[PDB]
Design a protein around this ligand. Structure first.
Ligand code: CA
Ligand code: CA
Ligand code: CA
Ligand code: MG
Ligand code: MG
Ligand code: MG
Length: 759
DNA sequence: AAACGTACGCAGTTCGCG
DNA sequence: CGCGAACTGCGA
C-alpha cells in the first residue's frame, strides 16, 4: 500500500521516496532513476540542436538539458510531434522553463509545472491507498493558555490529549485528579512525553481537527522556544509547514497527517464547524465546549481544571471517532483521483478533477494543456456564460406538491452529447450533437476525453446509493449519504471545471453547452407536464421543479406525476432521466431560491430562507421557523401572525435573551481592502485595536445596542456586552431582523409590517 | 510553489443624487 | 426624502 511519495536530493541527484505499508510493516522504497522532464513543440526538428545548448542557473548550479527525445503524442485527440526534454534535478525545470519557451523556434512548452512526486505516481501507474492493509490511527489535540493582545503561542501549552483504540489520555504539567490524566513537571516534559507516545505507538495516521493551522504551528513555536527537537516523522524529521493558497498545511514524513476540518467542510453542511457541532451532527450526541477564557481562568486560579481536562480528553476522543468514520471515504477518493490521501483530503475540487485528468492523459498518451498565462487568465475571468434556468415562482401556499428532479443533469448531458474540448467542433465526423442556443457541435464518433470518465463516477454514486438503502444503521446510512453526495459534487464539478479560469482543459464552449442543454431539457419538461398532463409548475430551478394539479387530492397528483414520468422519460434520450424525489402536503414559495415545503411526515425542508443563513440573528431564525411551522404544518395563519406579535412584544420589553440577538458575519479579506464599512467591519476594526488579530476567515460576533448613528456605530462585539449597562436595540431587531424575515412570507396573506409589529 | 469548479439570486447597509 | 447603486455576505 502506497501512503505518500516525495523526493530528497543526494549529491545533486533527486531520490524519489515511496512511503509504503506492506504486510503490516512500514517501508521506504527509494528510486534514483526517475528523470524530470517537460515537452516542447518546435517549428522544425532542425532547431533541437539549439534548444539543447540553452542553459540556466539556480542557486549556484548551472542547469543544462541532459537528453532530448522525439515523441509521438496526441493533443485533444489530434496527432502531434513534441520533443521530450530530460533534466537531472526537478528544480532545473523552473530555472530553465521560460528560456526554452522564449526561443524563436519553440512554439510552446507543455507539462512543465507538475510536482516531481506527483509526476512519479502518474508516470509509474501507482495508485495510493490501494490494498487491504489496516492503518493504525492516533488523534491528538492541544489546550493552550491564551490572552488577548499577545503574540501567537506566547503562552504555554497546558494540555496535550491523544486517543486511539486503547482510549484517551491527557498529558499536563498541573496536578489534575483524573484517572486518564498523566501529570508531568513542566511544559517541556509534557511535549517530550507526547513525542515519546507517538514514537512508541508509531501510528500511520495522525488525526487532528484544524491541526493544519493551529495545533501543529503552536507546537512548533513552543518547541523552538523551549529548544525541543519535535521529531515526529518516521525519518526523525519535524513536521513541515506548507502553503496552499490562503491557509497552511502540515505534513509528517512517513505518516499521514489527516486534518478532519477540510474534509468535514467538503462533506457536511452545517451553520458552524466547531468540533462540538461536527460531533453532534455525525453521532447525534452533544459535546460540551470550554472556551479559552475559561481554560485560562481555570489554569491561573487553579480552580475547575478537571472540567478542562475532560474537555481536552473528549477533544482527542471525538477527533479519533470522527477520523475512524471519515478515513475510508477519503481513502476511496485517494484511489479514484490517484494522489496521496494527504493531498486529496485538503485539495479543492478543481485540483481533484485536474490531477485525475493528468493521470488519464498520461494513460492515453494525451499531451496535457498548460495552465493559463496571465493574459489568458484575465481574459477567461472577464468572459462568462448563461447558467441554469430559475423560474419566478407562483407565490403563496400550495398543497399536494411533487418535486421532480433530473438525475445528475450536467454529468448526463456531458456523456449523452459527448461534451468535451477534444470533440468540440471536430472535423470529419459522421455524427454531431449541436447544443441549443449556443450552437456548439460535438463529435459523436468516439467517446470524448472527459465523457469517457464520468460514467464510472456516476456508477459509483448509484452503488453507494444502493447500499444507502440496504443499511439499517443510521450511522452507516449517514456516512453513505455523506459519501454519495460527495460523488455528486465531484461529478458536477466536471462541468464547472470547464468554466474554471485556471483549468488546463478549459472549455467555455463546453460549459455553456451543458447549461444550454440543461435549460432546454427542463423548459421542455415543464411545458409538457402543464400542456399534456394539466399540472401547474409552481417553482423551478436548475435540475428540478415543484408542481401540482390545482383542485386535486394527494392521490391524484401522485398517480398523474408517475404517469408523466413514464411519458417524459420515454421522450428523454441518452442518460437524461427525471426522478420522483418527494411529495409534500404543503409548500410556500417566497421568491427565487427561497421556498419551504413540508412532507407527509411533518418534516419541514427550506431553501435559501433566513432559517439556513448564519448571518441572521437567532431571534429572527427562531421566529421564522415557528411561523413556517404554523403555516406548513398547522395551516393557521393567525397563529403565525400571533407569534410575530409576541416576539416583537418580548423584544420591545427586553425579555428576549441577548444571546439570540448575536449576528455572525465573516471578514472576507484584509481590513484595508474594504471599500465600504458595515457593522461587522466597523466592529472588527475595533477588535484590532483591542488586541485581536483580524484576518480573512475571522467570524465577527456582534450585537446592536440602543444608541445613535448608523448600525455600525451601535454595534459592539458580544464578548463586551454587559446586560447591566448595555440595553440592546429592540427597535433594530424588530424592524431589521424579525419583521423582514417574516413579512415577505406573511405578505401572501394580506399582512403588512404594521399588522405584525407590536405597538 | 501553488492558486478557492460554475451561474443565478436575495437582501441588509450605506449614502448621495434628484 | 425616497429611490437607486455600490458594496457586501451568503445562499443549485
Ligand atoms: Ca427538495
Ligand atoms: Ca441527483
Ligand atoms: Ca448582510
Ligand atoms: Mg507532499
Ligand atoms: Mg496561577
Ligand atoms: Mg469567467
Amino acid at each position: 500500500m502506497i501512503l505518500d511519495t516525495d523526493y530528497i536530493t543526494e549529491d545533486g541527484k533527486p531520490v524519489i521516496r515511496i512511503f509504503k505499508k506492506e504486510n503490516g510493516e512500514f517501508k521506504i522504497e527509494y528510486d534514483r532513476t526517475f528523470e524530470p522532464y517537460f515537452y516542447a513543440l518546435l517549428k522544425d526538428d532542425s532547431a533541437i540542436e539549439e534548444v539543447k545548448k540553452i542553459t540556466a542557473e539556480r542557486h549556484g548550479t548551472v542547469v543544462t538539458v541532459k537528453r532530448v527525445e522525439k515523441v509521438q503524442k496526441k493533443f485533444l485527440g489530434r496527432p502531434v510531434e513534441v520533443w521530450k526534454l530530460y533534466f537531472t534535478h526537478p528544480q532545473d525545470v523552473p530555472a530553465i522553463r521560460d528560456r526554452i519557451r522564449a526561443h524563436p523556434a519553440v512554439v510552446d512548452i507543455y507539462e512543465y509545472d507538475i510536482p516531481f512526486a506527483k509526476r512519479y505516481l502518474i508516470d509509474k501507474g501507482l495508485i495510493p491507498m490501494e490494498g487491504d492493509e489496516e492503518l493504525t490511527m492516533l488523534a491528538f489535540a492541544i489546550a493552550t493558555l491564551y490572552h488577548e493582545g499577545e503574540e501567537f503561542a506566547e503562552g504555554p501549552i497546558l494540555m496535550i490529549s491523544y486517543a486511539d483504540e486503547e482510549g484517551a489520555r491527557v498529558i499536563t504539567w498541573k496536578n489534575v485528579d483524573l484517572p486518564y490524566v498523566d501529570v508531568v513537571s513542566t511544559e517541556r516534559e509534557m511535549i517530550k512525553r507526547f513525542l515519546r507516545v507517538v514514537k512508541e505507538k508509531d501510528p500511520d495516521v495522525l488525526i487532528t481537527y484544524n491541526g493544519d493551522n493551529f495545533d501543529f504551528a503552536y507546537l512548533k513555536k513552543r518547541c523552538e522556544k523551549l529548544g525541543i527537537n519535535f521529531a515526529l516523522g518516521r525519518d526523525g524529521s519535524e513536521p513541515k509547514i506548507q502553503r496552499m493558497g490562503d491557509r497552511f498545511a502540515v505534513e509528517v514524513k512517513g505518516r499521514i497527517h489527516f486534518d478532519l476540518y477540510p474534509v468535514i467542510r467538503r462533506t457536511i453542511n452545517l451553520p458552524t464547524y466547531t468540533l462540538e457541532a461536527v460531533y453532534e451532527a455525525v453521532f447525534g450526541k452533544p459535546k460540551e465546549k470550554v472556551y479559552a477564557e475559561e481554560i485560562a481562568q481555570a489554569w491561573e486560579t487553579g480552580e475547575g481544571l478537571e472540567r478542562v481536562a475532560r474537555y481536552s480528553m473528549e477533544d482527542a476522543k471525538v477527533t479519533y471517532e470522527l477520523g475512524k468514520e471519515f478515513l475510508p471515504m477519503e481513502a476511496q477518493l485517494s484511489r479514484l483521483v490517484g494522489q496521496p490521501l494527504w493531498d486529496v483530503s485538503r485539495s479543492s475540487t478543481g485540483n481533484l478533477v485536474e490531477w485525475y485528468l493528468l493521470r488519464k492523459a498520461y494513460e492515453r498518451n494525451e499531451l496535457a494543456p498548460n495552465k493559463p498565462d496571465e493574459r489568458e487568465y484575465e481574459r477567461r475571468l472577464r468572459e462568462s456564460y448563461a447558467g441554469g434556468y430559475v423560474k419566478e415562482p407562483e407565490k403563496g401556499l400550495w398543497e399536494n406538491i411533487v418535486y421532480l428532479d433530473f438525475r445528475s443533469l450536467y454529468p448526463s448531458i456531458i456523456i449523452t452529447h459527448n461534451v468535451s474540448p477534444d470533440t468540440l467542433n471536430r472535423e470529419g465526423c459522421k455524427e454531431y450533437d449541436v447544443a441549443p442556443q449556443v450552437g456548439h457541435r460535438f463529435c459523436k464518433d468516439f467517446p470524448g476525453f472527459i465523457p469517457s470518465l464520468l460514467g464510472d463516477l456516476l456508477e459509483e454514486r448509484q452503488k453507494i446509493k444502493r447500499k444507502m438503502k440496504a443499511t439499517v444503521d443510521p450511522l452507516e446510512k449517514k456516512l453513505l449519504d455523506y459519501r454519495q453526495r460527495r460523488i455528486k459534487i465531484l461529478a458536477s464539478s466536471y462541468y464547472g471545471y470547464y468554466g474554471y479560469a485556471r483549468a488546463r482543459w478549459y472549455c467555455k464552449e463546453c460549459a455553456e453547452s451543458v447549461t444550454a442543454w440543461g435549460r432546454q431539457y427542463i423548459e421542455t419538461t415543464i411545458r409538457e407536464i402543464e400542456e399534456k398532463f394539466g399540472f401547474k409548475v409552481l417553482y423551478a430551478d436548475t435540475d428540478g421543479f415543484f408542481a401540482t394539479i390545482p383542485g386535486a387530492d394527494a392521490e391524484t397528483v401522485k398517480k398523474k406525476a408517475k404517469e408523466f414520468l413514464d411519458y417524459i422519460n420515454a421522450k428523454l434520450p441518452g442518460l437524461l432521466e427525471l426522478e420522483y424525489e418527494g411529495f409534500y402536503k404543503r409548500g410556500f414559495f417566497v421568491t427565487k431560491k427561497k421556498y419551504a415545503v413540508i412532507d407527509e411526515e411533518d418534516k419541514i425542508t427550506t431553501g435559501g430562507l433566513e432559517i439556513v443563513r448564519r448571518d441572521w440573528s437567532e431571534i429572527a431564525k427562531e421566529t421564522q421557523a415557528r411561523v413556517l411551522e404554523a403555516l406548513l404544518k398547522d395551516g393557521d395563519v393567525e397563529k403565525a401572525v400571533r407569534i410575530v406579535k409576541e416576539v416583537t412584544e418580548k423584544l420591545s420589553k427586553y425579555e428576549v435573551p441577548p444571546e439570540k440577538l448575536v449576528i455572525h458575519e465573516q471578514i472576507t479579506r484584509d481590513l484595508r481592502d474594504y471599500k465600504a464599512t458595515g457593522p461587522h467591519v466597523a466592529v472588527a476594526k475595533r477588535l484590532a485595536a483591542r488586541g485581536v488579530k483580524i484576518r480573512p476567515g475571522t467570524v465577527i460576533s456582534y450585537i446592536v445596542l440602543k444608541g445613535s448613528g448608523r448600525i455600525g456605530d451601535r454595534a459592539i462585539p458580544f464578548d463586551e456586552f454587559d446586560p447591566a449597562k448595555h440595553k440592546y436595540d429592540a427597535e433594530y431587531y424588530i424592524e431589521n431582523q424579525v419583521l423582514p424575515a417574516v413579512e415577505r412570507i406573511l405578505r401572501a396573506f394580506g399582512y403588512r409590517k404594521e399588522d405584525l409589529r407590536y405597538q
